[PDB]
Amino acid sequence: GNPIVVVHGGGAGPISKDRKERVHQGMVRAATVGYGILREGGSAVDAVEGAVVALEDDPEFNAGCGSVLNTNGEVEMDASIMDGKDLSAGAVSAVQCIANPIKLARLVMEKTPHCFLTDQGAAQFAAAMGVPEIPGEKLVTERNKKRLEKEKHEKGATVGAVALDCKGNVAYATSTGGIVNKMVGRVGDSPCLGAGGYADNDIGAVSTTGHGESILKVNLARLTLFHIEQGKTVEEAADLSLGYMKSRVKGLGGLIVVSKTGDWVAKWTSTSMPWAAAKDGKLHFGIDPDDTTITDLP
Amino acid sequence: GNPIVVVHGGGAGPISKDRKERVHQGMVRAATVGYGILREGGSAVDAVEGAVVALEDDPEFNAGCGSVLNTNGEVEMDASIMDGKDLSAGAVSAVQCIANPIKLARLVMEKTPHCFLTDQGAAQFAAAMGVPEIPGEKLVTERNKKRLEKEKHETVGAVALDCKGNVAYATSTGGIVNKMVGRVGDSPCLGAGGYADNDIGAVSTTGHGESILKVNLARLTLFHIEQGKTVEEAADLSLGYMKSRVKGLGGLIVVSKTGDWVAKWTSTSMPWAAAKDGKLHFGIDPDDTTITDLP
Ligand code: NA
Ligand code: NA
């Protein structure tokens, strides 16, 4: 039984030669953790969580440490995780002062009769679960402070993973800092099932990135899976769904897909999207269209 | 075109003879407001909002005043509204101390570059928009206080098709009895709480929120319509899937772009009403439909 892990960063382009290598190493690390969990017989859920925790902790990515700032220069995070076997899910929105929103989303799934907690109640739940509070300042990066000032002045005028485990289970995890200069309490697509991602053993798993409002309006992740159900390949499904978002709501973004049959793809309508996939002892990586590197994974 | 408005309450248990009549009058009033807006040439969005504001203000219904209580005996509300023309939307979650979450969801849609605000940020936005703050107690009913105590010791919506061919949905709720602080249901989530698309139709749902979210109930219903199923087949298939896959019960109302509509549920009951071609349709229990004329 051949397990697969696919990871994505946020559509980033253009980037400096030296930052491109840090992004590359970050993607490799996330996919290595994810694949490593799968190879030891771990679940698709553990794999996607492991991969996303890596990207949250990595300051080079828009999730956890490295999250973009809202209008007040604060880090407000969203995350969701879904299990394709029983459709079990966990999600958090407008979370602050925690290192790993995806672990909190996993906790919502496993420890509550719910699948979505927000802001104050999500903060209270994190405290009750013994999740350590970190200075909100430890999530803020200088690059994100500059981005915010740039955005505010111009106005003068989103990571994830999908997996198929050894037992045939599929899962997705999506985590974000949102959009630069967002309003206080703005909720994106990331914590919303069907938009931020979707996982179903009878179809496959999707994790998305891009303009959250657009992803929400088109239900991007569930839409992708609807084309797969209708007989389209993972590539056709991704193209059709992304294409529809572009034409209908003028939205750009990207997604990663894994079908129940083991087919996978990473596609985007934005400039770039860092991505990596691991399957059959091989690591696939890319950032720009039609520029992919494949290396052997012992 | 012939405009249509469909409204729903929350799935209800066997209720008292006199409570059924207040429920009936509430549903009639919501559909009357909705239909009245449509008949004057108003948009589908204005119609669904008008119908839902009525149900929020009505203490008989689980939205606005009459919202079920959370674990702390407080009212925390969720709402979403969508316009089928451009897929523009507005949603709010864990909102407190405001009379009309649906009006706040409409303001998110019209006055911000976003479509979903939560808790503290939604409250800040409401204040900046001049939305009056009401005491939490004004949203609390005695029936709800009893429900909470009972539970501890062990949801409304509208769809419309306007004269210009636009479709819309509005969904508003108090959530589930004894829910955790900050619990977000299906109601403010596009594709789950509802979905509106001029190229298909509009859906508004009710029931076990977690189940509705997991199956993407409203968008799922519309996928079946896209595949050639009638509004009735689509509703049955989607509700049936929620029941079998995630053990969830609930209900929904649908209006297709062609004018076909239906109200279906897997729960015990679901108060509903529909207005089209000067006629009002109403029911609570399966196959109890009453039809009356309206000039
Ligand atoms: Na990061
Ligand atoms: Na009410």
From Swiss-Prot, chain A:
CDD domains with a match to the protein in the record: ASRGL1_like (cd04702)
Gene3D superfamilies found in the cross-reference section: (Glycosyl)asparaginase (3.60.20.30)
Tissues where this protein is expressed: Expressed in brain, kidney, testis and tissues of the gastrointestinal tract. Present in sperm (at protein level). Over-expressed in uterine, mammary, prostatic and ovarian carcinoma.
Primary enzyme class: hydrolase
GO cellular component terms, A-Z: cytoplasm; cytosol; nucleus; photoreceptor inner segment
Catalytic activity: L-asparagine + H2O = L-aspartate + NH4(+); Cleavage of a beta-linked Asp residue from the N-terminus of a polypeptide
Active site: T158 (nucleophile)
Chief location: cytoplasm
Cross-referenced InterPro entries: ASRGL1_meta (IPR033844), Ntn_hydrolases_N (IPR029055), Peptidase_T2 (IPR000246)
Any one Gene Ontology molecular-function term assigned to this protein's record: beta-aspartyl-peptidase activity
Tagged with keyword Hydrolase: yes
Known outcome of mutating G168R: Found in a large family with early-onset recessive retinal degeneration; abolishes autocleavage resulting in loss of enzymatic activity; increased protein aggregation; changes protein localization that becomes perinuclear, does not change ligand affinity for L-aspartic acid beta-hydroxamate
Subunit structure: Heterodimer of an alpha and beta chain produced by autocleavage. This heterodimer may then dimerize in turn, giving rise to a heterotetramer.
Similarity annotation: Belongs to the Ntn-hydrolase family.
Name of this chain's protein: Isoaspartyl peptidase/L-asparaginase
Species of origin: Homo sapiens (Human)
